[PDB]
C-alpha cells in the first residue's frame with residue numbers, strides 16, 4: 001500500500017469545530033521537574049479536552065497536551081499480518097490508557113466522501129477512513145500516517161477517542177489494556193468506521209468474533 005505521509009490533518013471542505021474551548025483547570029504544579037501534571041481529575045481531561053498552553057497552571061509539566069505536541073510512541077513497526085494484509089505492532093510494552101498516536105488524513109464532508117467512494121474508492125479491497133463528527137470523516141486512502149495500517153478486532157487492545165484540541169475535534173489512539181512487545185494493535189472499526197456499506201469478513205480470530213466488520 002502506497003500513500004502520502006502527513007504530520008497533521010489536511011482539512012479539505014469542512015471545519016470540525018468542537019464548539020467549546022478548553023478553559024483553565026485547577027491542577028497543581030508538582031515541584032519535582034520530572035513529575036507530570038494534569039493526570040487525575042483534570043477538568044479538561046474530564047470532558048476530553050487538551051489544555052491550552054497559554055493558560056495551563058502546569059506549563060511544561062502538563063500531560064494533557066499529547067495531541068497538540070505530537071507525542072506519538074516511537075516503537076511502532078509495520079509487518080505482514082497472516083490473512084489480514086499489513087498491520088502495526090508495538091516493539092516495547094504499552095500501558096493501559098497510554099496515548100499511542102494521532103489518526104491523520106484528509107478531513108472531508110459526508111458528501112465529498114460518498115463522491116470519493118464512487119469516483120475512486122469503488123474498486124478497493126482495503127478501506128481507510130474514520131468517523132469524526134456529524135457527517136465528517138477522516139479519509140486516509142491517500143494521506144495519513146502509520147495509524148492507517150492498524151487492523152480491526154472484535155476484541156481490541158486499543159480505542160479511538162475523539163478529543164477537543166484548541167476548539168477542534170481530533171482523534172487519538174489510546175491503549176485499552178496492557179500490551180507486551182510484539183503485540184499487534186487492533187481497534188473496533190464498527191464504533192468508528194463510516195457506514196456506506198463497506199461490509200468485509202472479519203478474521204480477528206476472536207473466539208466470539210462478530211464475523212463481519214460493519
Ligand SMILES: C[S@@+](CC[C@H](N)C(=O)[O-])C[C@H]1O[C@@H](n2cnc3c(N)ncnc32)[C@H](O)[C@@H]1O
Pocket residue numbers: 001083084085086087125126127128129148149150151152153200201202203204
Ligand atoms: C485501515 S486498513 C488496515 C491495513 C490493511 N490491512 C493494509 O494492509 O493496508 C483496513 C483494511 O484491512 C483489512 N482488515 C483490517 N482488519 C481486518 C480483520 N480483522 N479481518 C479481515 N480484514 C481486515 C480490511 O480489508 C480493511 O478494509
Ligand SMILES: [Zn+2]
Pocket residue numbers: 025026027037038042043044051064
Ligand atoms: Zn489540569
Ligand SMILES: [Zn+2]
Pocket residue numbers: 025027037038051056057058062063064
Ligand atoms: Zn494541563
Ligand SMILES: [Zn+2]
Pocket residue numbers: 153154155202203204205206209210211212
Ligand atoms: Zn472479528
